[PDB]
Structure formats: structure tokens, C-alpha cells
Amino acid sequence: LTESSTSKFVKINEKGFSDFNIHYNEAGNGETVIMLHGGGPGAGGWSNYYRNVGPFVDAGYRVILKDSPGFNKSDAVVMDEQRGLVNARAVKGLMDALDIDRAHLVGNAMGGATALNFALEYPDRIGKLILMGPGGLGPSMFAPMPMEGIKLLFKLYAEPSYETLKQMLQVFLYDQSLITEELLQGRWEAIQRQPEHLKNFLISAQKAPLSTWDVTARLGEIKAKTFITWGRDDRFVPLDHGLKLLWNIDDARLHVFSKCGAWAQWEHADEFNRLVIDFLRHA
Amino acid sequence: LTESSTSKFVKINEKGFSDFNIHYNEAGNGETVIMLHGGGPGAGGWSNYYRNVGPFVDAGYRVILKDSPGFNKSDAVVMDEQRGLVNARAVKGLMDALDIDRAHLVGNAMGGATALNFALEYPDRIGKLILMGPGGLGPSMFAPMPMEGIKLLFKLYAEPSYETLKQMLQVFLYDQSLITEELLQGRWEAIQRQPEHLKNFLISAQKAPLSTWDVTARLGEIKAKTFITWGRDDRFVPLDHGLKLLWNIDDARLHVFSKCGAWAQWEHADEFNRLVIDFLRHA
Amino acid sequence: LTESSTSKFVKINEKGFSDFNIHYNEAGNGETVIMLHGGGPGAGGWSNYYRNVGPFVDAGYRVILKDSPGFNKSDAVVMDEQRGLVNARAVKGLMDALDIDRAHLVGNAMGGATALNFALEYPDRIGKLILMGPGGLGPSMFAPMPMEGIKLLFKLYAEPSYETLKQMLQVFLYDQSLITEELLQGRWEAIQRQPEHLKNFLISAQKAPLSTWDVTARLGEIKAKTFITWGRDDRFVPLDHGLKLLWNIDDARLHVFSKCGAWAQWEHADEFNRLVIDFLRHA
Amino acid sequence: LTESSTSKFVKINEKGFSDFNIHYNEAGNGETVIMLHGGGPGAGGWSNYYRNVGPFVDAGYRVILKDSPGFNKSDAVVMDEQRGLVNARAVKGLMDALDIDRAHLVGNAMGGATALNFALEYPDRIGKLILMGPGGLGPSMFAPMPMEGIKLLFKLYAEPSYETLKQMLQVFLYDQSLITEELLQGRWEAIQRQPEHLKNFLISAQKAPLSTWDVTARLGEIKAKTFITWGRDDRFVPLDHGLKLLWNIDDARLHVFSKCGAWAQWEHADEFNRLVIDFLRHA
Numbered sequence A, B, C, D: 001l002t003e004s005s006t007s008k009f010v011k012i013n014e015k016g017f018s019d020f021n022i023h024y025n026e027a028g029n030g031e032t033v034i035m036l037h038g039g040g041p042g043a044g045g046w047s048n049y050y051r052n053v054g055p056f057v058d059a060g061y062r063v064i065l066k067d068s069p070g071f072n073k074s075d076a077v078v079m080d081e082q083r084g085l086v087n088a089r090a091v092k093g094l095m096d097a098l099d100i101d102r103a104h105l106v107g108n109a110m111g112g113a114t115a116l117n118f119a120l121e122y123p124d125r126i127g128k129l130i131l132m133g134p135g136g137l138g139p140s141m142f143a144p145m146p147m148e149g150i151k152l153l154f155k156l157y158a159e160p161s162y163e164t165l166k167q168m169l170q171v172f173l174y175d176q177s178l179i180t181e182e183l184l185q186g187r188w189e190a191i192q193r194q195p196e197h198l199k200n201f202l203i204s205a206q207k208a209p210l211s212t213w214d215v216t217a218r219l220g221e222i223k224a225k226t227f228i229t230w231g232r233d234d235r236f237v238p239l240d241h242g243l244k245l246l247w248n249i250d251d252a253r254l255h256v257f258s259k260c261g262a263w264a265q266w267e268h269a270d271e272f273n274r275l276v277i278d279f280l281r282h283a
Ligand SMILES: O=C(O)/C(O)=C\C=C\C(=O)c1ccccc1
Pocket: A037, A038, A039, A040, A041, A043, A108, A109, A110, A111, A134, A135, A136, A150, A153, A172, A236, A237
């Protein structure tokens, strides 16, 4: 599978969205699993999940790697509401357009926020819920905020450079040897190709600060079976939030990977794939 | 499989042990997995692991449910050293007697301490290491100690009664509906059948308090791939110790079950069996 | 100072309360400090704060040790709303009746909940806010709930006995040598003298479970300078809630006493008195 | 009081030290309080404690602001052992040279490590122990390590610049408005004046990594009354280590300041001074 061979576009129409272009990468034909990416400069579905798409398709799922609004090849947008919710509206728009009744969701960081908001807003449209270090769940009991990684994410949005990108990826990943030229060049291309996304993200963030994303009080509404993953060494979203989700969601479990930053699906892809596929099949 | 059909005895000779009788329950014939039980009155291998033995044997392992010294049908003993270490010596004694070169270990609570000590003392004799809420790892950063459950364990040792046993099991398990008459009668029979074990446990505990069990400082020596499990609702061994192990053992992961006390292998048997079998096969 | 010499009654009329009798103990004539007690059987203002009233009066404060509705010598009541809020309404009723414009509040456990609700509902009527292990702030990130101490508090409400009272106090206090016959007999007398309070508490608790008390989401509204204290060894209200308050209230500090249960003002009276008086004078 | 008027030098001779020059700033004549600084580039006694020296002297103490070996105006040194211990040896050397029998110690970060090692090695020579976010106490249960601030401290040691110094101070302090030109120019002068200290620090750190500083296992030996302070927002030394000390030292208390980085004695000087003076007088 390649980005090119799996690349698709769909126009969505949900609430605020009118004829809004969503890019996604699709493979497989079984039960639908929609995978949702983080909010860093240059993020997108394919780059975030390229180590996961194959095994999930092999396991028999239909995998959709979605570009959230204002990222990668989806349309540009300035958001005045918290991104988790707006993003979830876009997932519903995509599912309606593609005639998908229910989907399992997988989301890291911003994508975890998207997935939480979707489960809250459209409980009849979700299967299982897989969350990797979801962002926006209020203060940490231990970590000073903004987190180290979030400071770098804002620095790169405001003053994009290849050097600052490398600095951000060094904080993002636990194992520095994973930062190949291929990874760097790829993310840098996505940043260079869509400068408007960077500008728009910063305007959006002013309009709706991270505090507005906090859906903690509503977590008791979630009836989806939930699998929470965390990197032990995540410098972007605090580990204690894994506990917050575990205590507040009715049917959840928590898996923490050692030697792992904020990209567990990439850093620990084999174990992540096995655990999540097992969860989807058997939980 | 039944307790009777799987029941075996072996005399061990390791360090302090001379012609010491160890009872165990064995089934299967593949790679050896030795499962080690907790330290509560009436504990033993079969009762602790009866929901696990079948699936592990089905998966192709040789399962040995070991009775630790001073429990169930193994010989009575008064220990002057911390039980984790003495217990680990007994595992080695059993393996030598049965000509087993390496074993995967599974242990909860006291059995987790046994398994940690074994990995430390005999690193050439262990495969993978599976730890469920291991006891004795020093103070908690959050929980007042002695833990609520430990107070009840000592109360039942000192003044055994069916009522106090039920009180202890109510704290041990998250879901109260799991406390059937079968469970209660079974544990009560093991308590009634070996009063000497109760007396000896209390003498042992005076000679080597829980502080003596703390092997935290040596955790960096462990080279075994390690899978740590915890019940979110464990009132016997504090949840933050799962983090302690995750930060201090080189290659570990942590899985926390929601709605789960100190007997995760029984309370969440299906998920526990699937996760641990996957770990043994693929990690 | 004695209970008898300081004993007063005042009828209150606030919202739901009509000609409702509130008992309190008053001494001193400076700035008013209202001290609010916990929710255990037999609790009351004088017994909870008798080691604190003298030093605060010596420091120049007017101290009011208030009996909350449904405790000690205040009127009996069945509450259908969370007690923190109803209790706070009663504090306002008392202050209005006594022509007190602003008060500093001190409250432990249930009384901490009362004080938080008061600061939220009547921000113009509070000076400084002193909180000792306040109850009802939602789940713990570490402690299984209901807490060990809360289980015993409900057991004593339902089946009052001198033995169960002693068991509860053993969990309440860190240092067992503090449990004198005087303490036990005193609390037992308050329990024996007002059986209706026990019955009513249990009815109230069914109508408004501890979850209803959770004001976490509103903590950002508190503008009062806040001093949070915790016992390291509190088995009634979880230590991590001290962190929750510290991160969520604008101007707070946290002081944790070692070797201390849920009655820090009594167990560590000298240090508590010095710290809180310094805070009132200088913060 | 000024740096110049209080400036003194003393040659020390303790274990490895031979005629080793120690610089310190002294004022007052009562009970001796030795204050010990952190390990950042350009750190020293006067700059670290200039908001504290006056009030402590006013309270009646003899205050010695000590420059640790390899900092500020003390002699250059390459250390092959953990700095906490070597530093503590230097404190003893100073006390012996000045005929001081016992001292109260105050230390932040590296200085907290110095003070812990001193209490362990010379328990007959310490009064009370005041610890502000002491460094080197092993892994955090929550924070990825090396901490954000420690990364910047090493960056500034290796590539000193005014810009990198400002970046470090921005992480060091919670309130950015405290970073005046006076603060920056002062620290920069100390860095420019002693380049050899920077080079030597980096050589020392290679010889004895932060892991070597971990004295956790010995904390039970400390008999000194101990006051632990932490900044809620400390990005250099993890907040949970305040809990570690509180559970492991016999007679400790913990005070956490909100809106506070790694320099609590400067960021919250008034409250810090009041609390520590009260502790020295009355605990
Ligand atoms: O998208 C990425 O891969 C990336 O580099 C960082 C993602 C950061 C987040 O999505 C995020 C969102 C909210 C809070 C914390 C973190």
C-alpha cells in the first residue's frame, strides 16, 4: 500500500461545514476503523499511521486514515470552537458521505480528543474507542503546563524551520535513532506545502485555548469499550491523564509502553498493532 | 482438568531446604510457565489460577501451579528471611528437581515478589516475567500503609473465621457478585485444613517485616521481558507500584484493568489470558 | 474555655431553612473565623476543634465552631441535595443572623466541602479559605473508592456501637495512642444522644451520593487566598485531591503533614495552629 | 547587606580537599544557617539567596551563603564522585575551619542533594534540614527524564550564550516578569568570569551521572527535622519527589507553592522566609 494508491477525497456537509474537502487514505473492506492524527505542523493520516494501516487491513478491517480539517490535504479552516469537537463533526460528515453506519475510532493526541468528542456527540455511530495520549483533558496533577512538547509545537507553527522541526521530533520520540532523514523531509514537505494551515492553526488556538477542549466532566457518558494507550515518556500529553480516563470511563483499560514518546503506534508498532487488533476482535 | 488429576509432589533441596515437600498442579507439555500465588490465608496454586490453567495449556504451554512453602499442600515452614527470596529459592529447587532449564514466571502479590526475586537471583533460569500487583516494593507515594487489604489479611491469619474470610474477599475483589459460596467454602477448607500454616505465617512476618521484601534498588538488574498488570481497584498493593516497576525495569509494559481488585487473573480472566498468551508468543 | 461557657444557639432563615436551630461555640472578638467539622457519626464543632479554639482566640480572632445541620446540637434534617451546598447555605444563614459581613473559613472533610461551596456561592462573604482534606471532589487517580475510612463511617452510621466507633477512630488517626477513653466516650455520647441524626444522615446519603458533591469544575471561580492541608496518611479523603485543589484554585498552597490521618488540626495541632494563624495574618 | 560587605574566603581540608578555596557570604551572629545553591551555570550563594539573607539575619540567625566547589568564587574542581556527596564534604570542611559545631541547612536542587548527603554523612553536625526541590533522587513516577530544565542546563553549560541563558531562566521561573535585565546580566557575568567551571562541570557529569546521586535507599537514616518545599511548576526536579521524601524521611513536612518554578526562595520569598523561620524557631 502507498499514499498515492489509497488517496481519496470527499466533500462533507455537517453543521458548520459546507462542501468542505476532506482528504483520507483508505484500504481494506471489512469493519471500518477510522484513524485520527495529532495536531503538530505537517501532521496527516498517512504519515501518522503508515506502520499501522497494513496490519489492520491484513486483519480484515477497512482502514480510513483521515486528514482533519486544517491539516495536510484537507481544506484550510479557522476554528472558533475547540478542535476536538469541530474535528468530530468532520468525522461524522465523512461517515455520512461514505454511508458508514458505525466506525471504530483510533486517535492520538489531538486525534484522541477528536475521538472522545465523537463518542460523546454521536454515541450511536461509534464501535470501539482507542485512545493514545489524548490531548486537552485539563490540568495534570504532576506536569507543569504547557507541556515541553506543546511549547515546541507552538514554536514550529509560528517560526517553521527544518531545525525546529528536528527539535520537535527529538522531543516527540523517545528513541532518537528513529529520526531518519525520510521522516524529517516528509514532515517538512507537508509544512512547506501548506503554509496557510500553520497560520490558521495559530489563529484558531487564540480563539479556543486548550482549556476549552476539556471534556473531563462528560466522560461518564461514554458507553464505548475503550482501550487507552500511553507512552511512559510522552512529553506532550501527561501520563496521569491515562489514569484520569481509566477512572472516569465506564469500560476502559490502560496500556503503557516503556521507552515511548507521543507516537506509540509508530515507536511500538508491532505491540500496538497486536494489542489493538486483539481488542477489536475480542473485547 | 481438575485439581486431583493434575496434583503432584516433589521434594526439593536448595540452600536452606532439605527434602522439603512442594505440592504443585501440572498440565500441558510445551514451554514451562510457573504460576505463583499470593500470601493470603488458604491461598494455593490451583485455587488462584484455575481460570488460567486451561487456556494456557490450550495455547501450548506446560503449566505448573506451585504451592509456595508454608501454603496449601506444601510443607510447613517458619521463615526468618523475606518470603519473596525464600519462595524464589523454592522455585529453583522445584525446577532443578524436575529438570526444567528455563521457565516463564507469572506471579500476583506475594507471587509477584517471588518472581522478581527469582529473576534477580537466577537470571539464567527465567524466560519472560509476568507480574500482577507484586507485593513488598516499599512505600507508596499515595497510599497509607499497611494497605486496607493487608490489615484484613493479618486479621484473618490471627483470628480465622468464615465471616472474616468473607470480609477479606469483599476487599480482594472489585465485583462482589463473584463471591460465591464455592469460593468461600474452598478457601475456608484450605484454612481449616492447615492451621499450622497460619501460625507459622505470623511468626515469619515478625521475623521479616514487609520492608525487608523491598528489592526496588535491584530492579535495574532485570533483563527479562516483563509484563506488569494491575487492578485499578487493588486495595492490597498500591497502583503506583505499577509505575515504579515500569520506570525501573528495562523492558516492561503496564496493563491496568478497570473494575478489578487484587485477583486480575480471575476477575478479568479472558482479557488476562489473551494478553499474557500474546506476550509469551510475540514479545 | 469550655464547651458550656462558649455554647450558643441561633435560628437561621436562608433558602430552604426556616427557623432552623444552629448550635455553635464562640470565643474571642476579632476578625471572625468559622470552623466547620467533618461528617462522621457524633461529629461537632467543639470536639473537632477544641485544640484550635484557644490559640486562634489568643491570636486575636473571633472563633465560631459551628455544628452543621443534622449534627450534634443543631436541628435534625434530611437533605435531598449534596451536603456541602446545604451546609454552606446554613453558614450564610448564621452569618446573616449574627450580622457578620465576611468570615475566614476553616473546614476538614465534609467541612472542607462546606467551605468550598460557600466560597463558590457567596464570594463576597468570605475572607481566606483553609481546607483540610475536603471531601467529595470526585474520583482519586490512585485510591480505590469508597475509601477505607468512608466504609467504616457508613458502617457506624448504620450499626452504631462503641467497638465500631473505636475501629473508625483507629483508621481516622495515624497515632493510635491518641485514642483515649475521653475521646471515645465523648464521641459515643454524641452518637447516643442523637440517634435521629444517624438515621437522617443515611437517608440523605441515598438521596445525594458523594458524586453529587463534586464541585471540581467550578474551582477556577474561587478568588479567596487558599491554604490546603492534608494528612499524608489520610484514609478517608485521598492525598491526590490536595494536588487537584492546588492546580485548580488560583491562589493556593499545599501543606502535607507526615504521620497524620484525617484530623490534622488535632493530630498536629501546634504546627497547624502556627501555620494557619501565620496564613491569616500575613498571606 | 551587599555581596561585597559579606564576602569571605576560607581554605578547607576534608578528605579529598587540600587547601581548597571556598567563597561564602556571611551576615548575622546567631545560630548558623548554611544555604546551598543549585547547579546551573553561573549559580552562587549570594545570587541564589539574596532575597533570604536579610530576613533570616533579622530573625537572629548567622547566615552563610556558600559557593559549592566548582561554582562562582570557590576553587575549580573536576569531580569523579556524585556532587551531592563531594559538596557535603566541602560543607563539613567549611564548618570545621570556622569552628561551627552544628548548622541548619537550606538547599535547593543540587544544594538539596548536598544537604541530604550532609545529613546522612554527618548526622551529629546538622540541626534542622530544609530542602527545596532536591535533585538526584532517581526516576520520577510521572515525569520523563531528563527533565526539560535539565536539558537546558546542559545546553547552556556546553554552548553558553546570553540567549540560551534567558531560555533557561524562562523555564526556571514560573512568572516571566521576574526575568529582569539585572538577573540576566548578573548570571551572565558569573558565566563569563569562570569559563573553566563550565568545562569542569561537563567533565564531572560524564564521570558521575545523575543516577549516582540517588540516596533514596538511605533516607530512613535521617533523624533531622525536615521541611521540604516544592514549586508546583518546577520543570527541573519532579514534584513527586516531594512525596518520596515525605514518605521516606521520619519527621518531614511538605509545602508546595503554586505558580512557582525551581527557585521558590526567590519567587515566593516572603512566604518562604516566614515558613522556614517559623520552622527553625518552633518545630
Ligand atoms: O501531530 C503530531 O504528530 C505532533 O507532532 C504533535 C501532536 C500534538 C497534539 O495533537 C496535542 C493536542 C492537544 C494537546 C497536546 C498535544
